[PDB]
């Protein structure tokens, strides 16, 4: 049905998911159980690591485009990122590397992330019409390998603990580049313009070195993050300015204001909905004994079985406005099932974890797959710069949320953590409801605006 | 996944016991282990546990008596039972969940070892 370079692609994609989220399913838990950080501290230090491996996405797209050319940098970014992997893997006999090995990823994963796809639609003619056909398998494929890793990790780390874990990350990562390796014919007319120029070493260097500098900034922030929080918001008070300074410009602004209350919602899965199905939720569905911490799977899961559903069925307005009543009903699920619906211990059925996730699934398949591809149809690189600004800030946010629901080491009673998740999953949902409420009440004005 | 108690027996009021529990595959350094007990004719009931971070829980008529441990090297969990009375008489059960929670019921523990007999004589 498809190119041949579809395929190749897809399963690069695939297996390079696979090792980010074995590492991101396990490591809230990894820092509480073998860093013996608290779940507030865990909590945090999982939102800078957020942030900044969204924030350097904006490297690997320019670093791609014009320094290395995209195959290059496909390599590169693999390398960097399996070298984090293996470094994650080493922090157990040497666990000061924590941060260095995480900033080595964050890195990593910078110059990779944009480039797959950027090849992918240099395999089409121009105007092919299966190309989204092919963009909504290439999300698919993110969502399968996401889907292992999510479920399959810490069942590892469990039984094998978590320098296999992460080697197995790195394992995934370099299969990926032998993949790749295999099928370069495939792909020897696609490219960038620098793919296809001999490679400048000075460029490389630049490359190089910047990456190391960065990878230490990251290591720094990590530790550090209540300096990460004022830079971030000095440079977003700053780049405020300097955008009001320089009106589809200012539709694009609320719709970034919107996409960062999303992605205050999104990284909750990894930590306050990860530790709310830890301490507040039975661990057995249909019959099975399940890692909690595997309950993470069932968001991509339902991504996976829902793209090509949505695909086959207002517009972006209507469809960010749409995303946001989803997210918002899913944490008024959690809240309800834990004021209502839980049982004297104080644990709920995981059915109503299955339908949180759905509502927060769905919220992502109308809002972040739908957001950029589109605030590109309203405007430029000032803007992807503060776009990936803003959602790092968005990422930290979040973290300092979840801090809400942070339960200490010493207590062991259900019935004393399901109110705190309840009242903070109660007002997430009731604040993202008027947000979406607000939202809606700006769909005609806004849908004027992009005329 | 499956747990294995040992240590269990036959004392006298006023005796002291010891039982243990390890697992085979994975490591119970991330279960919460709460031991649960069964006199003849009535119901299991939690009797005291210690989760994955050293938080402990204690049904009140064992409290002062009994001591949950745990040993993180030898990756076992221990009760160390003292001033043993004869309403202590019950098969005992290790049971692990996933977590930093001990809940009381045991439904909300997956993993369950088979049961040691412990009687105290008057």
């Known amino acids: 049905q498809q190119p041949r370079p579809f395929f190749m692609i897809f399963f690069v994609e695939l297996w390079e998911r696979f090792g980010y989220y074995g590492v991101q399913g396990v490591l809230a838990v990894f820092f509480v159980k073998q860093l013996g950080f608290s779940q507030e501290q865990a909590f945090v230090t999982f939102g800078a690591f957020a942030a900044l491996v969204y924030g350097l996405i904006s490297i690997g797209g320019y670093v791609g485009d014009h320094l290395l050319g995209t195959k290059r940098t496909i390599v590169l970014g693999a390398l960097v990122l399996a070298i984090g992997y293996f470094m994650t893997g080493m922090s157990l006999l040497k666990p000061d590397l924590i941060f260095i090995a995480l900033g080595t990823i964050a890195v990593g994963n910078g110059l990779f992330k944009a480039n797959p796809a950027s090849l992918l639609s240099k395999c089409y003619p121009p105007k092919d019409p299966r190309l989204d056909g092919a963009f909504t398998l290439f999300y698919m494929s993110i969502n399968i390998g996401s889907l292992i890793a999510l479920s399959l990790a810490p069942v590892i780390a469990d039984r094998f603990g978590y320098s296999v874990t992460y080697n197995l990350c790195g394992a995934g990562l370099i299969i990926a580049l032998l993949v790749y390796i295999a099928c370069r014919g495939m792909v020897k007319d696609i490219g960038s313009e620098p793919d296809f120029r001999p490679m400048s070493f000075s460029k490389l260097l630049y490359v190089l070195l910047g990456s190391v500098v960065m990878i230490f900034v990251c290591a720094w922030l990590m530790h550090n993050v209540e300096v990460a929080n004022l830079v971030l918001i000095v440079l977003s008070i700053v780049v405020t300015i300097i955008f009001f300074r320089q009106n589809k410009m200012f539709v694009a602004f609320v719709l970034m204001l919107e996409a960062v209350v999303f992605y205050i919602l999104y990284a909750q899965m990894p930590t306050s909905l990860n530790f709310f199905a830890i301490n507040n939720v039975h661990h057995e569905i249909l019959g099975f004994s399940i890692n909690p911490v595997s309950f993470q799977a069932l968001n991509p899961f339902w991504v996976v079985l829902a793209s090509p559903i949505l695909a086959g069925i207002l517009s972006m307005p209507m469809k960010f406005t749409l995303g946001m009543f989803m997210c918002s009903l899913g944490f008024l699920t959690a809240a309800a099932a834990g004021m209502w619906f839980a049982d004297a211990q104080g644990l709920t059925s995981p059915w109503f974890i299955v339908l949180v996730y759905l509502f927060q699934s769905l919220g992502e398949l109308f809002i972040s797959a739908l957001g950029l591809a589109m605030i590109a149809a309203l405007v430029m690189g000032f803007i992807l710069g503060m776009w990936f600004l803003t959602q790092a800030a968005a990422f930290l946010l979040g973290g300092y949320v979840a801090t809400f629901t942070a339960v200490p080491d010493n207590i062991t009673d259900p019935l004393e953590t399901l109110p705190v998740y309840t009242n903070v999953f109660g007002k997430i949902g009731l604040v993202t409801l008027g947000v979406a409420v607000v939202m809606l009440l700006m769909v005609p004005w806004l849908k004027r605006m992009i005329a | 996944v499956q747990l294995v108690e040992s240590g269990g027996g036959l004392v006298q009021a006023g005796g002291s016991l010891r039982l243990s529990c390890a697992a085979s595959?994975?490591?119970?350094?991330?279960?919460?282990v709460g031991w649960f007990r069964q006199a003849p004719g009535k119901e299991r009931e939690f009797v005291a546990g210690?989760?994955?971070?050293?938080?402990?829980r204690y049904k009140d008529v064992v409290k002062g008596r009994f001591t949950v441990s745990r040993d993180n090297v030898k990756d076992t969990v221990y009760l160390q039972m003292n001033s043993l009375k004869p309403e202590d008489t019950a098969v005992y059960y290790c049971?692990?969940?996933?977590?930093?929670?001990?809940?009381?019921?045991?439904?909300?523990?997956?993993?369950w070892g088979q049961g040691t007999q412990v009687t105290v004589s008057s």
């Open positions: 595959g994975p490591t119970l350094s991330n279960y919460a």
């Open positions: 049971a692990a969940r996933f977590g930093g929670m001990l809940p009381l019921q045991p439904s909300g523990y997956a993993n």
């Open positions: 210690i989760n994955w971070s050293s938080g402990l």
